[PDB]
Design a protein around this ligand. Structure first.
Ligand code: HEM
Ligand code: HEM
Ligand SMILES: N#Cc1cccc(CNCCc2ccnc(-n3ccnc3)n2)c1
Ligand SMILES: N#Cc1cccc(CNCCc2ccnc(-n3ccnc3)n2)c1
Ligand SMILES: C[C@H](O)[C@H](O)[C@H]1CNc2nc(N)[nH]c(=O)c2N1
Ligand SMILES: C[C@H](O)[C@H](O)[C@H]1CNc2nc(N)[nH]c(=O)c2N1
Ligand SMILES: OC[C@@H](O)[C@@H](O)[C@H](O)[C@H](O)CO
Ligand SMILES: OC[C@@H](O)[C@@H](O)[C@H](O)[C@H](O)CO
Ligand SMILES: [Zn+2]
Lengths: 404, 405
């Protein structure tokens, strides 16, 4: 019923009772576990019950359950859904809802920060142009000259029988990938498709390894529009290494602001199809995944050769060695640039503290072990040895289909 | 698409569907409401017969004689045995098939490319602890092969109704002692504190080193376990040195050659073999990362980092990451120099991906525990990290069982 959760480094045991609050099924069944899969395979009373649950969450949060304001708010929601098939959140409710979705996000290692989130209400946006203004302000606010601050901008909710507000980019800041005549890629192979979409919508493309993509922004039932981010808004960090003088000569660099723009924020049964959020990077996202993944910049071999490692065989651990120096270069360069970043040891340590906080606060914490455990040096971090329970709580961030 | 889990590799973009999970007749710990896939240990003639029937069907399928006269006769013979005795017995080749299939079916083992090449030792005639010792020594000699390691399993008599189990009390045939100190610390391997004390309680005169090989506590049916010291010449060990860090040798670290699990229950057609030690060869990260660097194991990370003169006062120096790499390299280098079979985490995960493709074609899927398959260092540097995996319980199976004390 309630799962026993063991930490194998410390021998300590907890029991997750929070998971009983899950109203949504994930992909596992008793016959097989699908916990390693990245993506999911796929009226009024329903909305009304998700709404009431949410409003109840909110008033309990401000310690006013049963108050007249609480009972009144419930009747407003009920009156509105009964008449219109939908309802609208008050700004304070949206702010609470956004924080809870972040708190409930099982794949986020940064949730120790969940209570500190600047929420921009952009629900009065009626055009792609206005979306762009809102986005620019978000980036300006969040970047803060390198003293990064977590933020989310919330655009208008989905509505029955009209197109969604959507940001076509998967991140607000990302580098282009240009498919070359011989079928290689200059730039970021993860972004070949969005790059091609930008060009087809009139963007004049650069030809570098790190060309910042323009935004494709879509207002309901309209073709998406192209907007070039002003370069002065996009803070970037040149990569150099503390001891390897040759490393800077690789011409490598990365952007400061990690901002997801393709996810759906669901609150009280309402869905926000455009609600970009940003925090700050954990170094391995850049050093290990972005730069070392075989299907990303894939620079492992190049670095190892610069290090004169023996690439002929796997047992020299040339890959492990290069990867460490790359992550070290990312930490060093961000610190030298005074741009907020957290290494995977510090991050995982703070996540453990978060598990403890949430255990006392809520009786558990949904966590996806495969995502929380860093992509290098797994068992060198405390989260490796910590069992975790995964489940879906609402409010939630969800994946949604690419709008094209 | 099909009504089966869609499985994606995100590096290559390739898609398979697992149809093999349909053959699973045993529930795991997950439900639609929550995934417990990360938990290490999650919680009658009628039942025996259906399990037995199922395995006999598996056996005859594998020899391509499903539905044959010998198939139906074997089914009848098993039902009649269970009818008169309450249990039944495997033919020798059925045992070999079952032990191989249990290995093939093990979601947590990355070494499964080798599954067809397992030497199965039949020790179902064993009738004493002394005899178990002989069989185990023989296993260790055969499997070690002076450094050219060979996969093997030795199978002792099955669990019998109204008779005590054959049990090996040790969790591995070879493991190091852990001596609790008066200051509260542990000398040796902290993993082994309890078994070390049980050995002493049973009359073992304890050492006082960091790497004292443990004696075996062996239990024949309905008898107190008996203590047996392994003759040092049978236990191959490898002193650790580093290819370029000349001081690493001075740390006096070492590890044993033979990784032999000895406390898992082997289950085949409902028959339960409570003592069936098996052994392969190490993947280097088992020694280098887990045994030597786990905080609750030898915990040598800080020590090595200090010798490397790293900044252990801040996480951002990546001192743990650097030291861990050199320790893993020392493990590989030393085993290679000593000519003792070992496989690094890159070569092992590449072979497992090949194994996945083999099993996709052969069986339509492969049960795999992602958390265990992905190595504890350099995770996304290996191809298995980017491979989605479906986990389920197939039988024959290796299973955990409670410590006999
Ligand atoms: C403040 C510092 C933050 C850190 C250090 C952090 C860290 C991370 C990391 C390492 C991941 C794994 C992503 C990947 O590897 O693809 C992740 C995912 C995620 N984070 Fe955060 N995060 C932060 C802020 C935020 C904020 C402000 C939100 C929402 C308001 C958020 C919500 C999420 C969600 C929903 C995911 C899952 C993304 C996906 O599945 O693609 N995080 N986070
Ligand atoms: C031949 C070379 C082999 C390699 C490289 C290999 C590799 C591995 C590794 C790295 C693990 C993870 C164990 C841990 O991290 O605690 C494992 C687990 C396991 N292996 Fe193997 N293995 C090999 C041979 C075998 C054989 C011969 C068998 C049985 C006939 C076997 C059955 C198992 C089982 C049942 C587990 C799960 C153990 C547990 O959950 O504690 N393996 N293997
Ligand atoms: N769909 C999809 C899909 C599948 C796997 C990974 C993905 C990207 N994951 C998020 C990557 C990312 C990038 C920048 N920033 C952040 N980020 C910011 C705060 N927390 C995470 N996360 C999407
Ligand atoms: N019960 C239990 C339990 C929980 C976590 C880890 C554990 C040990 N896992 C096996 C370790 C191990 C040691 C030597 N050899 C092998 N081995 C040999 C062939 N394949 C794996 N495996 C047991
Ligand atoms: C197949 C596997 O689930 C996939 O590669 C996951 C593994 N863990 C991850 N962990 C993080 N933090 N980010 C990721 O994209 C992934 N990808
Ligand atoms: C808590 C977590 O499940 C536990 O530490 C697991 C993770 N993955 C593992 N993987 C392997 N190969 N061996 C292990 O012992 C573990 N331990
Ligand atoms: O080129 C488009 C891709 O970046 C995009 O499809 C992402 O894979 C997707 O949005 C999930 O991140
Ligand atoms: O010292 C006792 C332990 O080694 C023992 O309890 C093991 O943890 C157990 O047998 C499973 O590995
Ligand atoms: Zn699961």
């Amino acid at each position: 019923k309630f799962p026993r959760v063991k930490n194998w480094e410390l021998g300590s045991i907890t029991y997750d009772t929070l998971c009983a609050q899950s109203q949504q099924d994930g992909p596992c069944t008793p016959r097989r576990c699908l916990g390693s899969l990245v993506l999911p395979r796929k009226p009024a009373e329903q909305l009304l019950s998700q709404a009431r649950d949410f409003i109840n969450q909110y008033y309990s949060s401000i310690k006013r359950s049963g108050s007249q304001a609480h009972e009144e708010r419930l009747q407003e929601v009920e009156a509105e859904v009964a008449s219109t098939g939908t309802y609208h959140l008050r700004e304070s409710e949206l702010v609470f809802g956004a924080k809870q979705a972040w708190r409930n996000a099982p794949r986020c290692v940064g949730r120790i920060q969940w209570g500190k989130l600047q929420v921009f209400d952009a629900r009065d946006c009626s055009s792609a142009q206005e979306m762009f203004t809102y986005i620019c302000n978000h980036i300006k606010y969040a970047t803060n000259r390198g003293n990064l601050r977590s933020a989310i901008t919330v655009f208008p909710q989905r509505a029955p029988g009209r197109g969604d507000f959507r940001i076509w980019n998967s991140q607000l800041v990302r580098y282009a990938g240009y498919r070359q005549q011989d079928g290689s890629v200059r730039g970021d192979p993860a972004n070949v498709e969005i790059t091609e979409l930008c060009i087809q919508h009139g963007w004049t493309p650069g030809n570098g390894r790190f060309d910042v993509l323009p935004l494709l922004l879509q207002a309901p039932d309209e073709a998406p529009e192209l907007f070039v981010l002003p370069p002065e808004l996009v803070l970037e960090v040149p990569l150099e290494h503390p001891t390897l003088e040759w490393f800077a000569a690789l011409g490598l660099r990365w952007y400061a602001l990690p901002a997801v723009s393709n996810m759906l924020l669901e609150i009280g049964g309402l869905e926000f199809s455009a609600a970009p959020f940003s925090g700050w990077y954990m170094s391995t996202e850049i050093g290990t995944r972005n730069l070392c993944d075989p299907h990303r910049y894939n620079i492992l071999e190049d670095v190892a050769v610069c290090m004169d490692l023996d690439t002929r065989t796997t047992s020299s651990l040339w890959k492990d060695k290069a990867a460490v120096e790359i992550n070290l270069a990312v930490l060093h360069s961000f610190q030298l640039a005074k741009v907020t970043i957290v290494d995977h040891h510090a991050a995982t340590v703070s996540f453990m503290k978060h598990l403890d906080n949430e255990q006392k606060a809520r009786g558990g914490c949904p966590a996806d072990w495969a995502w929380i455990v860093p992509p290098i040096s797994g068992s060198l971090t405390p989260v490796f040895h910590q069992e975790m329970v995964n489940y879906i709580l609402s409010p939630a961030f969800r994946y949604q289909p690419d709008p094209w």
